């Protein structure tokens with residue numbers, strides 16, 4: 432209950448899917464062309480059983496100029512531009528890309544994948560063979576659960592580009608209006624009646640970020656899977672608005688324990704759906720909350736779990 436960074440250690444039995452950042456680190460070592468080929472390969476194979484939702488209209492508008500610029504290039508330049516993004520080279524295109532929210536980056540690559548499939552953007556060279564390190568990276572990816580697979584792909588996408596500066600422009604999709612109160616569903620969690628946890632889940636499912644933020648302490652933090660804590664209400668609200676629209680949280684069961692100094696620690700396990708895949712991918716998730724004596728959230732971590740065997744009382 433003292434520091435955010437120490438609270439990271441609550442529920443240390445929870446086995447997170449650290450194969451995800453492991454695999455991203457291996458991927459990040461590869462030659463840029465192999466990075467692009469490997470994701471092409473993974474995207475094509477995954478597409479046989481899983482369809483990516485179309486990017487939103489607003490997103491596509493925001494990425495349109497950059498997409499047009501690539502589409503107007505000769506094939507060798509197209510391939511160079513894509514390599515620049517993978518290498519995190521400092522170029523205008525890479526700086527534009529870095530300014531984008533994850534969804535806009537994903538929609539940019541969704542479009543390029545379609546154009547590559549159609550032959551209008553320089554495809555991976557015909558009969559391309561991956562490097563020794565890259566073939567093994569792809570094999571690991573293809574052995575993972577779908578929820579882990581899509582997280583590897585998102586993390587690879589988000590990592591591309593070049594950030595120069597701390598307070599650079601941030602572009603994101605417009606904020607959706609919260610769901611009308613009448614049509615809202617309420618979660619049920621075995622074992623857990625805690626109103627802060629239930630209101631967390633229900634407000635996020637309603638895209639009601641202004642209500643959700645009011646659950647947190649001023650200094651409180653939210654730790655997304657495999658990322659550092661996001662600290663304080665302004666930064667956490669920013670993250671909700673830019674990155675947390677249209678999720679579906681399906682918490683199943685939890686456990687509630689005392690912590691030092693009148694705090695309460697609560698662990699919930701369940702599933703989450705991203706609007707990119709809807710009901711076709713259910714990620715196995717734990718939430719770990721540390722609530723102060725008044726019930727506000729000092730810390731919440733969201734973990735992608737190593738296997739369904741990590742869900743409580745499988």
Ligand SMILES: CC1=C(/C=C/C(C)=C/C=C/C(C)=C/C=C/C=C(C)/C=C/C=C(C)/C=C/C2=C(C)C(=O)CCC2(C)C)C(C)(C)CCC1=O
Pocket residue numbers: 466467468470471474483537540541543544547581582584585588635654655656674675678680703705707714716718733
């Ligand atoms: C790149 C590339 C390509 C294309 C690639 C493409 C098109 C790839 C597309 C990949 C896509 C669309 C991946 C989407 C992933 C979404 C995830 C993991 C969301 C998780 C959300 C979670 C867990 C949120 C949970 C949450 C909960 C519960 C909270 O309680 C609090 C909020 C929080 C957010 C933490 C080509 C094919 C063109 C080849 C070349 C190439 O490189």
Ligand SMILES: [Cl-]
Pocket residue numbers: 674705706707
């Ligand atoms: Cl998402």
